[PDB]
């Protein structure tokens, strides 16, 4: 399927890690609307300080989704990790078999495009 001999192996490994390490994300809104993906989600912890002390500690979630099922995903649409509601911010370019989905939290802020 690919002039690769290698990307086939990385795709098989990608499926393996998704099956063994991941969660059943369900998506609402957007062109995909109701759909289910198997993506491994993590929530690294990041803090900003702003003024004197204005600590706004939060998290920066990621999903590591496979590109084929998440094409034309756009950015404004939301997402649901089980019982929790997120929203995609940006989509990383494909590394060969998948991409990192960078996730927000809560309602996406407006559109502000016109």
């Amino acid at each position: 399927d690919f002039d690769n001999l290698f990307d086939a192996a990385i795709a098989r490994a990608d499926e393996t890690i998704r099956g063994y390490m991941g969660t059943s994300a369900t998506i609402t809104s957007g062109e995909q609307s109701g759909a289910v993906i198997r993506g491994v989600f993590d929530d690294p912890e990041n803090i900003s300080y702003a003024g004197q002390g204005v600590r706004v500690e939060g998290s920066s979630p990621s999903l590591f989704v496979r590109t084929d099922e998440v094409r034309q995903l756009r950015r404004g649409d939301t997402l649901t990790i089980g019982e929790e509601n997120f929203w995609v911010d940006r989509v990383s370019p494909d590394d060969g078999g998948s991409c990192h989905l960078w996730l927000g939290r809560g309602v996406p802020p407006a559109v502000n495009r016109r």
């Binding site: 490994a13 063994y20 390490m21 491994v40």
Partner: protein, 67 residues
């Protein structure tokens, strides 16, 4: 509930045989490995719980001799 146990074990034997039994996975800090079992014990386990279950005959008994 032995039949699906048979099915899963036979599958796992197939994936181990061809190319698709995983020993380690790693996600840059999220890694885990599994112990690997030899194929001989796999086939012994398959045969044992294959004959033990209610599926049909697979091996008969001795062998007669006549002139």
């Amino acid at each position: 509930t032995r039949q699906e146990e048979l099915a899963a074990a036979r599958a796992a034997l197939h994936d181990l045989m061809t190319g698709k039994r995983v020993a380690t996975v790693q996600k840059d800090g999220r890694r885990v490995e599994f112990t690997a079992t030899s194929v001989s014990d796999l086939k012994k386990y398959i045969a044992e719980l294959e004959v033990q279950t209610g599926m049909t005959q697979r091996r008969r008994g001795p062998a007669g001799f006549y002139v």
